[PDB]
Amino acid sequence: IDTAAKFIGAGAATVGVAGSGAGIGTVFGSLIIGYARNPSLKQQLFSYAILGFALSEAMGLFCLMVAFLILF
Amino acid sequence: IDTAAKFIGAGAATVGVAGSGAGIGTVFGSLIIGYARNPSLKQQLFSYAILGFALSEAMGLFCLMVAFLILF
Amino acid sequence: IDTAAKFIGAGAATVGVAGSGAGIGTVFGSLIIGYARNPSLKQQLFSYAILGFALSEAMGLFCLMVAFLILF
Amino acid sequence: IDTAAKFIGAGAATVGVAGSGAGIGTVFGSLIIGYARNPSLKQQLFSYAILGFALSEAMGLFCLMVAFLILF
Amino acid sequence: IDTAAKFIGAGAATVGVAGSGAGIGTVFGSLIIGYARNPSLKQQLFSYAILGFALSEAMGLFCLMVAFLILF
Amino acid sequence: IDTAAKFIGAGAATVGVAGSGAGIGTVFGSLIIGYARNPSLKQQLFSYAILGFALSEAMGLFCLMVAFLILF
Amino acid sequence: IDTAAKFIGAGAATVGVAGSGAGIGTVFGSLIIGYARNPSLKQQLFSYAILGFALSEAMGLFCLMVAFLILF
Amino acid sequence: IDTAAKFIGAGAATVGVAGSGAGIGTVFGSLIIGYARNPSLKQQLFSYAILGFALSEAMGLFCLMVAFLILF
Amino acid sequence: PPVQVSPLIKLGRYSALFLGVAYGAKRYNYLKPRAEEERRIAA
Amino acid sequence: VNAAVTYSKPRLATFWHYAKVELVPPTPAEIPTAIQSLKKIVNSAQTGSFKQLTVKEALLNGLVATEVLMWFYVGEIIARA
Amino acid sequence: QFQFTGIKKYFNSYTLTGRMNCVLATYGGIALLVLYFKLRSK
Amino acid sequence: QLDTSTWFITITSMIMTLFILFQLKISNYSY
Amino acid sequence: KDRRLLEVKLGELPSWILMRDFTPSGIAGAFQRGYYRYYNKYVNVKKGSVAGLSMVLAAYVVFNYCRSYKELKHERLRKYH
Amino acid sequence: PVPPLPEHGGKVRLGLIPEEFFQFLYPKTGVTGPYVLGTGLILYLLSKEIYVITAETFSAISTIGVLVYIVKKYGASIGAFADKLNEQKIAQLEE
Amino acid sequence: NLFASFIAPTMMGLPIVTLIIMFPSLLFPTPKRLINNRTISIQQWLIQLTSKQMMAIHNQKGQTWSLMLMSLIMFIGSTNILGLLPHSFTPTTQLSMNLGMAIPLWSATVFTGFRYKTKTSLAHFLPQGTPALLIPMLVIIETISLFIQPVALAVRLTANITAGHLLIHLIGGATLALLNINTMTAFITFTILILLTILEFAVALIQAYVFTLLVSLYLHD
To answer: Considering only CB atoms, which chain F residues are within 8 Å of E19?
Structure first.
């Protein structure tokens, strides 16, 4: 009965990574429109974009790690 | 029963892939409006779009892989 | 024993179509605003819109395949 | 035990239509702002809006049909 | 057992109102910024908004109908 | 065993308020943008804003009411 | 048996609080782009946001309290 | 038994992190667009960005603490 | 350009038509009670 | 209506003369002619038969024989109702 | 026969890198061996 | 259904057709 | 003799079997003749029509239907007798 | 020095059945003979369950209908567009 | 029942998957004269039109790959369109050939990049510009992102066609069943409406499949 609980807990906790895709789509879209206005400043824009992408993916990875821990 | 638990956990695991659709929709939506503003920098815009689409797919396929692994 | 688990797993897995719906809604919505910028190039932006919709549909369609797999 | 267990599975497969409830709102919203800046060209805008709404509602009818199939 | 397996699909079938709420929020918001752009075109904007809100709410109420009919 | 069904059904129907919480922010957010470009017409922008907010909160209160009815 | 259902229902109730977290980002995001224009007009802009943040968090808390109520 | 209840409750509760990811995405997106438009205002723009990130992270940490409490 | 056909074939067509009608009627009569008997036995 | 004018009226005039000439029960006066044709068949049946004739003629005869075969199938449907 | 000379330049010039089908063959062989073992286990 | 571990023939035939037939017919074109 | 099979006499069929030599032309030769006979008649003209490909597609469809008969008649049958 | 192509190929009725079959049975069957054979073949195939009615039949009907509509509504334009290119090439080389 | 066409490698006494997969090539006659008939002029015009829109980015080395890409796109497009026939068998449904297509070309590109431009080909892992101080975190992100390309590139093709055919078959079964009970032509209307989208959804997949490989090759060339 414990194995069933572990399986369903893993199957429920894995959902939390859904939000990472939406955040990634949002940040990349902003970079596209932002570059259109000031192509000169394309050097500084990226640093911001990378930061956001990394932060969102880190949150998703944290949720995935929690799911892996509950599985094992 | 244990197999039933595996099946229900796998079925509930796949629901996290919905994030990929929203992110893909957002990134592409920005490219059209941005290009329309400044129809000069097609190459950089398309390169950034492709990068975004490549990076955004990782999470959904990751969740699907987790579901496939847990089922079998 | 297993029939109920498979049916409820299929019913839970079929909720992954929301992301594709949101994405296709977003892309076509961006197209109309982009077209309104300048009536010229409408075929080009239309091509971009069609590509985006098809890509979102492909990214969201393989959710139902898992439901059909669990059903049979 | 069979029909009762199918009742929840069929009921839990009618959530995918909710995602179709946001794309329609986003589409019509873009129509309002899109034409506000260009008062002419109403007909083509209306045609594009209708196309988008029909496509999104068909995507929802997909999940509705799956839910209908699950019961029987 | 039949009653125990009921009222859970009914509970899961009422979660479909989230998309309708999101769309109803999105449409009225687009009208505000649209009106501010050009105060002259007001009655047509209001008609479009009303049509969009009515359609979105009509789509949303389907989940409530399904939940009630399954309940009784 | 019916009490368990009541509890889990009430817990499942509670998730219906996410749509209202997500919809509320877009209306107030749109208001700030619309006011910045044309401060003069500060009065009219509100009626629409508060109408949208009232509609969204009513939609959330509906799910609250159905959850309360199921739990009692 | 009833205790397990109580725990499951209490755990499932907290899911709906994700709406506020989604809306806060949109609200403060509007402030940044809004302040970008007419910067001196800032007091009224900040006032409008505070209200939106308060309402979103109030909705989130209203969602949460049912979890403690059902737990005890 | 109690262990299955703990597993299910912990698994369901830990899914309230998608909102924080979506919020972080929007905040960074607004910052790049805002700076892109009006330069030489990085202090306030960066200030608003931090505040939003902190608010969203606190909102997510609340749900994380709830999951911790449920497990123990 | 209508063309008269060989009468030999012309009679042979109608003869087979009548014979087919007869066979169909007789076979239906034969198989009507047997089908009901088999269905009742299946109960 | 107009399509009925352009087809059914030609069905009753053009198609009528096309078919009624070739699709009608025969006069009893041709029965001896058919018997003589049976004698024609018998003469080859005893000896000669193919007599090293063309394949095309045999194909014509077989095709007409198959057309004759179809009517018996139609009769079963008529009786089936 | 008379077809090798048609695309001989292509084969010896540019498809040198693309001619590495060893990875695909090894993956297919390993998958087939594992499937055969599973089937034999019964 | 799609995984029955009989994958040798399809791969061989696809490689043959793609890398011989189509390239040879498509090479005889002008522009 | 060496004339076309549709022209050989009925009693000369064994004779034409002796003349069947080189008709396959190593089997492949007959296919070589058959491909060009159709291609040079319905396709390789100044202006063709859709009838050039429809015959091949219909033949493909009927060939595909011939393969699956086993499963269809196995259970898809509606009535009995 | 390839000799010029003939202007036309063959004539086909219904787009699927050639005229030679109609000509072959004309002296015996007559003007309207073979159509009866076709209808009888269809009826015999249906009656004896040689061809089975299944879910795939409606899909086949829809698939055939789409192609028929496309051919009937765009046949001529494609042909004229095909002619125009050869005309242009010939003009260039002659100049 | 439903999973009958997919698991059916051309059932016969002797397998004929080779005959099924080699058949599409008998639709592209090779030119043999300066001026030809209508059926081949359209083909060559289409090939010319498609060539100038995709291979117009690579400088000199990518121009060599032109024949392979055109052959690939024509082959996949011809295979997919022929499958819409009522009782056909689409080879692209099987995962075996999709797995035998992606790996060779992807490997060719990846170890072509290292052979000539090792210094720059090694640098593409780290994003250009200064990514703050998070270097070790993203270094492990993009390298795992590298390996997922063939898997997705095969799986999406293996999935979408099967999903479409399943939908068609189920809607046909539904419209058959409702004949006995009441009258509803809404289902056949759904079928005829969906058929347009299924007909035009294949070519988009062909285009995406080719374009992704074009982009990947251009990166290391």
So the answer is: 19
